[PDB]
Structure formats: C-alpha cells, structure tokens
Design a protein around this motif. Structure first.
Motif, PDB file in Angstrom:
ATOM      1  N   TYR A 172       0.807  -1.206   0.000  1.00 51.82           N
ATOM      2  CA  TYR A 172       0.000   0.000   0.000  1.00 51.82           C
ATOM      3  C   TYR A 172       0.842   1.258   0.000  1.00 51.82           C
ATOM      4  CZ  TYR A 172      -3.742  -3.147   1.285  1.00 51.82           C
ATOM      5  OH  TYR A 172      -4.651  -4.172   1.308  1.00 51.82           O
ATOM      6  N   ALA A 173       2.055   1.189  -0.553  1.00 55.71           N
ATOM      7  CA  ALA A 173       2.999   2.306  -0.669  1.00 55.71           C
ATOM      8  C   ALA A 173       3.398   2.881   0.682  1.00 55.71           C
ATOM      9  CB  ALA A 173       2.471   3.416  -1.583  1.00 55.71           C
ATOM     10  N   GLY A 174       3.303   2.076   1.733  1.00 55.97           N
ATOM     11  CA  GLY A 174       3.831   2.468   3.022  1.00 55.97           C
ATOM     12  C   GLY A 174       3.084   3.577   3.722  1.00 55.97           C
ATOM     13  N   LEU A 175       1.790   3.723   3.460  1.00 57.49           N
ATOM     14  CA  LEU A 175       1.007   4.682   4.219  1.00 57.49           C
ATOM     15  C   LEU A 175       0.845   4.212   5.654  1.00 57.49           C
ATOM     16  CD1 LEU A 175      -1.707   5.646   1.640  1.00 57.49           C
ATOM     17  CD2 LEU A 175       0.196   6.998   2.464  1.00 57.49           C
ATOM     18  N   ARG A 190      -9.192   0.099 -11.181  1.00 53.52           N
ATOM     19  CA  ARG A 190      -7.767  -0.194 -11.233  1.00 53.52           C
ATOM     20  C   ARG A 190      -6.878   0.968 -10.832  1.00 53.52           C
ATOM     21  NH1 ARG A 190      -8.987  -2.940 -16.246  1.00 53.52           N
ATOM     22  NH2 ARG A 190      -8.574  -5.199 -16.108  1.00 53.52           N
ATOM     23  N   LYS A 191      -7.428   2.109 -10.438  1.00 54.23           N
ATOM     24  CA  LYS A 191      -6.557   3.180  -9.977  1.00 54.23           C
ATOM     25  C   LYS A 191      -6.055   2.860  -8.581  1.00 54.23           C
ATOM     26  CE  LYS A 191     -10.017   6.185  -7.917  1.00 54.23           C
ATOM     27  NZ  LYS A 191     -10.554   7.565  -7.878  1.00 54.23           N
ATOM     28  N   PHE A 192      -5.075   3.638  -8.123  1.00 57.99           N
ATOM     29  CA  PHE A 192      -4.393   3.309  -6.877  1.00 57.99           C
ATOM     30  C   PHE A 192      -5.299   3.522  -5.676  1.00 57.99           C
ATOM     31  CE2 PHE A 192      -1.637   4.446  -3.302  1.00 57.99           C
ATOM     32  CZ  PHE A 192      -0.905   3.283  -3.215  1.00 57.99           C
ATOM     33  N   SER A 193      -5.717   4.756  -5.443  1.00 53.22           N
ATOM     34  CA  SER A 193      -6.575   5.047  -4.308  1.00 53.22           C
ATOM     35  C   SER A 193      -7.996   4.626  -4.628  1.00 53.22           C
ATOM     36  CB  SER A 193      -6.532   6.529  -3.971  1.00 53.22           C
ATOM     37  OG  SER A 193      -7.122   7.273  -5.017  1.00 53.22           O
ATOM     38  N   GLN A 212     -11.443   1.972  -3.314  1.00 53.94           N
ATOM     39  CA  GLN A 212     -12.233   1.844  -2.099  1.00 53.94           C
ATOM     40  C   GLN A 212     -11.578   0.897  -1.106  1.00 53.94           C
ATOM     41  OE1 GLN A 212     -16.231   0.711  -2.896  1.00 53.94           O
ATOM     42  NE2 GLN A 212     -16.917   1.005  -0.780  1.00 53.94           N
ATOM     43  N   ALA A 213     -10.884  -0.127  -1.611  1.00 55.97           N
ATOM     44  CA  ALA A 213     -10.230  -1.097  -0.740  1.00 55.97           C
ATOM     45  C   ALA A 213      -9.111  -0.462   0.069  1.00 55.97           C
ATOM     46  CB  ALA A 213      -9.687  -2.256  -1.570  1.00 55.97           C
ATOM     47  N   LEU A 214      -8.441   0.539  -0.510  1.00 59.56           N
ATOM     48  CA  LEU A 214      -7.430   1.299   0.210  1.00 59.56           C
ATOM     49  C   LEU A 214      -8.021   1.989   1.424  1.00 59.56           C
ATOM     50  CD1 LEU A 214      -4.623   2.311   0.465  1.00 59.56           C
ATOM     51  CD2 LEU A 214      -5.211   4.238  -0.936  1.00 59.56           C
ATOM     52  N   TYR A 215      -9.146   2.668   1.243  1.00 59.93           N
ATOM     53  CA  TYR A 215      -9.767   3.351   2.360  1.00 59.93           C
ATOM     54  C   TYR A 215     -10.377   2.404   3.372  1.00 59.93           C
ATOM     55  CZ  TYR A 215      -9.095   7.417  -0.391  1.00 59.93           C
ATOM     56  OH  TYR A 215      -8.529   8.430  -1.110  1.00 59.93           O
ATOM     57  N   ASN A 216     -10.858   1.237   2.940  1.00 57.16           N
ATOM     58  CA  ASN A 216     -11.292   0.242   3.911  1.00 57.16           C
ATOM     59  C   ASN A 216     -10.139  -0.220   4.785  1.00 57.16           C
ATOM     60  OD1 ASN A 216     -13.412  -0.727   1.365  1.00 57.16           O
ATOM     61  ND2 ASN A 216     -14.178  -0.141   3.381  1.00 57.16           N
ATOM     62  N   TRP A 217      -8.996  -0.529   4.166  1.00 55.18           N
ATOM     63  CA  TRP A 217      -7.811  -0.923   4.913  1.00 55.18           C
ATOM     64  C   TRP A 217      -7.339   0.161   5.865  1.00 55.18           C
ATOM     65  CZ3 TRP A 217      -2.483   0.572   4.448  1.00 55.18           C
ATOM     66  CH2 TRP A 217      -1.658  -0.194   5.268  1.00 55.18           C
ATOM     67  N   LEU A 218      -7.349   1.411   5.404  1.00 61.87           N
ATOM     68  CA  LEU A 218      -6.932   2.514   6.255  1.00 61.87           C
ATOM     69  C   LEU A 218      -7.875   2.708   7.425  1.00 61.87           C
ATOM     70  CD1 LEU A 218      -5.731   5.213   3.767  1.00 61.87           C
ATOM     71  CD2 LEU A 218      -4.418   3.642   5.158  1.00 61.87           C
ATOM     72  N   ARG A 219      -9.186   2.606   7.192  1.00 62.70           N
ATOM     73  CA  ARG A 219     -10.125   2.854   8.277  1.00 62.70           C
ATOM     74  C   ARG A 219     -10.033   1.769   9.334  1.00 62.70           C
ATOM     75  NH1 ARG A 219     -15.146   1.639   9.945  1.00 62.70           N
ATOM     76  NH2 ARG A 219     -15.460   0.213   8.175  1.00 62.70           N
ATOM     77  N   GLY A 220      -9.813   0.522   8.911  1.00 64.42           N
ATOM     78  CA  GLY A 220      -9.636  -0.548   9.882  1.00 64.42           C
ATOM     79  C   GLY A 220      -8.379  -0.392  10.718  1.00 64.42           C
ATOM     80  N   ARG A 221      -7.240  -0.171  10.053  1.00 64.01           N
ATOM     81  CA  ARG A 221      -5.969  -0.055  10.757  1.00 64.01           C
ATOM     82  C   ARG A 221      -5.941   1.160  11.675  1.00 64.01           C
ATOM     83  NH1 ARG A 221      -0.898  -2.164  10.010  1.00 64.01           N
ATOM     84  NH2 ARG A 221       0.869  -0.782  10.485  1.00 64.01           N
ATOM     85  N   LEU A 222      -6.451   2.288  11.183  1.00 65.41           N
ATOM     86  CA  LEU A 222      -6.494   3.501  11.975  1.00 65.41           C
ATOM     87  C   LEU A 222      -7.442   3.365  13.150  1.00 65.41           C
ATOM     88  CD1 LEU A 222      -5.467   6.261  12.311  1.00 65.41           C
ATOM     89  CD2 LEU A 222      -7.290   7.110  10.915  1.00 65.41           C
ATOM     90  N   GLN A 269      -3.664  13.300  -7.803  1.00 68.00           N
ATOM     91  CA  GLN A 269      -3.287  12.815  -9.131  1.00 68.00           C
ATOM     92  C   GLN A 269      -4.353  11.893  -9.701  1.00 68.00           C
ATOM     93  OE1 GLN A 269       0.234  10.560  -9.630  1.00 68.00           O
ATOM     94  NE2 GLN A 269      -0.517   8.729  -8.575  1.00 68.00           N
ATOM     95  N   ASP A 270      -5.094  11.199  -8.829  1.00 67.29           N
ATOM     96  CA  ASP A 270      -6.163  10.355  -9.345  1.00 67.29           C
ATOM     97  C   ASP A 270      -7.303  11.193  -9.902  1.00 67.29           C
ATOM     98  OD1 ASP A 270      -4.738   8.098  -8.761  1.00 67.29           O
ATOM     99  OD2 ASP A 270      -5.653   7.830  -6.782  1.00 67.29           O
ATOM    100  N   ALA A 271      -7.609  12.315  -9.238  1.00 70.94           N
ATOM    101  CA  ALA A 271      -8.607  13.235  -9.779  1.00 70.94           C
ATOM    102  C   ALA A 271      -8.185  13.795 -11.134  1.00 70.94           C
ATOM    103  CB  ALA A 271      -8.860  14.367  -8.789  1.00 70.94           C
ATOM    104  N   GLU A 272      -6.895  14.106 -11.292  1.00 67.47           N
ATOM    105  CA  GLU A 272      -6.444  14.687 -12.556  1.00 67.47           C
ATOM    106  C   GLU A 272      -6.508  13.686 -13.706  1.00 67.47           C
ATOM    107  OE1 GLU A 272      -5.714  17.790 -13.326  1.00 67.47           O
ATOM    108  OE2 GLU A 272      -6.239  18.428 -11.295  1.00 67.47           O
ATOM    109  N   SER A 273      -6.119  12.434 -13.442  1.00 71.57           N
ATOM    110  CA  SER A 273      -6.179  11.412 -14.484  1.00 71.57           C
ATOM    111  C   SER A 273      -7.615  11.139 -14.914  1.00 71.57           C
ATOM    112  CB  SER A 273      -5.515  10.131 -13.993  1.00 71.57           C
ATOM    113  OG  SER A 273      -5.594   9.122 -14.978  1.00 71.57           O
ATOM    114  N   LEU A 274      -8.541  11.138 -13.946  1.00 66.53           N
ATOM    115  CA  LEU A 274      -9.954  10.960 -14.265  1.00 66.53           C
ATOM    116  C   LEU A 274     -10.474  12.085 -15.154  1.00 66.53           C
ATOM    117  CD1 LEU A 274     -12.353   9.207 -13.730  1.00 66.53           C
ATOM    118  CD2 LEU A 274     -12.915  10.653 -11.798  1.00 66.53           C
ATOM    119  N   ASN A 275     -10.026  13.315 -14.882  1.00 65.32           N
ATOM    120  CA  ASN A 275     -10.431  14.465 -15.689  1.00 65.32           C
ATOM    121  C   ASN A 275      -9.973  14.333 -17.142  1.00 65.32           C
ATOM    122  OD1 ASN A 275     -11.390  16.942 -16.440  1.00 65.32           O
ATOM    123  ND2 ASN A 275      -9.990  18.125 -15.157  1.00 65.32           N
TER     124      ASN A 275
END
Lengths: 48, 49, 49, 48
Positions: free
Chosen positions: A32-35, B23-26, B28-38, D21-27
């Motif tokens: 996850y890029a180390g967040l 397929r983008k990076f951020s 929904q699964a990213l935010y699920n993981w963050l909300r659980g860990r946080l 950057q994800d917002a910009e690529s979507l645009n």
C-alpha cells in the motif's frame, strides 16, 4: 526505525530485561505504498 | 445506424471509466484498509491516554 | 489466496500484543473483520462472529 | 517522538498528493471521451 531501536536499547539497559521487545515488524506495508507508519510507531513509543 | 454505433461507443467509454475507478491506486479497498488499521490504533491509543 | 493471506497478515500484525484476560478477543478482532469484510458497523462484526 | 511526528506530516502530504493525481487522471479521461462523442454527433448532423 533506527532511532526507535536506539531508544529500545536504552530502555533495555535502564531497566533490566533483554527479552522484552516492543518494536515489531510490519509497520511498513509496501503493497500500500507504506502509508500509515507514523501511527504504528507513535503507538509503539506510547507502549514503551 | 450511426446513432447505434455512437451508443456502443458510449457504452465502451463507460466500461473504460469503470475499469479506471477499479484499477486506480486510491480505490475503495485502500480506504477500507486505512479505516480498519487507523481504528484499531486509535482505540489502543485512547486506552493509553 | 494472496488476498486471504493479506487478511491473515493484517490480523496477525494487528492483534499481536494481545492477552486474553485483558479484553475480549472478539472485540479486538472486530475492526479488522469489519474492514476486510467491508462491514459498516462494529456490532455487525460482533454479530457475524 | 520528533522524528515520528515529522514522518506523520510526510504521510499526510503523500495522501493528499495521491488523491489529487487520481482526480487529474480521471479528468483527462473524461475529456478524451467527450472528443470521440462529438465526432459521432458531427457525422449524424451530416446525414441530417
């Protein structure tokens, strides 16, 4: 991480317990890029 | 007929946007993981405070 | 699967440093289950366990 | 502790950068799809 291990050695030398460890791996998540490492390290410093 | 092929182009574009939002990076699964860990770290830190 | 293995790794690092007589196991594992199964509440994760 | 709070500042900045950057690529994707659609409507006006 290097400085937190320095502080852990200082804790292990102040009070006498070599087996007692606090800094655990898995704080870095490369898939996850180390967040969110600061949270884990702040929590673990709080535990120490 | 040109109207029909225009609508199929629109459908393929919608499919492309949906594959982008999966397929983008951020995603929904990213935010699920963050909300659980946080949430776990936050609760333990609350107890120490 | 690598995804269920990621669940195992996250719960393993998460519920590391646990004692049974300090708190309930279910309430401790409930946030990671609520996130990995994408559940909205924590009482739902209590319920399904 | 000073090192950890510095690191958590970096984490916040990285989170903002990723979402931006994800917002910009979507645009940019929306713009290219608009270009294809206006080509089709031009051909339809010619047939009219």
């Amino acid at each position: 991480v290097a400085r937190c291990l320095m502080a852990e050695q200082a804790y292990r030398w102040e009070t006498n317990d070599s087996s007692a460890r606090f800094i655990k791996p898995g704080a870095w998540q490369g898939t996850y890029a180390g967040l969110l490492a600061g949270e884990t390290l702040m929590l673990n410093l709080a535990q120490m | 007929v040109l109207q029909k092929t225009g609508l199929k182009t629109q459908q393929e574009q919608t499919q492309a946007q949906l594959a982008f939002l999966q397929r983008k990076f951020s995603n929904q699964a990213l935010y699920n993981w963050l909300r659980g860990r946080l949430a776990a770290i936050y609760f333990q830190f609350y107890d120490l405070v | 699967t690598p995804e269920i293995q990621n669940l195992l790794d996250t719960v393993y690092n998460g519920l590391q440093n646990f004692d049974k007589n300090k708190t309930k196991l279910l309430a401790a594992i409930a946030p990671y289950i609520a996130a990995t199964l994408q559940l909205p509440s924590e009482n739902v994760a209590h319920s399904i366990l | 502790r000073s090192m950890v709070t510095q690191l958590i500042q970096f984490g916040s900045t990285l989170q903002n950068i990723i979402e931006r950057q994800d917002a910009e690529s979507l645009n940019a994707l929306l713009q290219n799809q608009a270009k294809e659609l206006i080509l089709t409507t031009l051909s339809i006006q010619d047939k009219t």
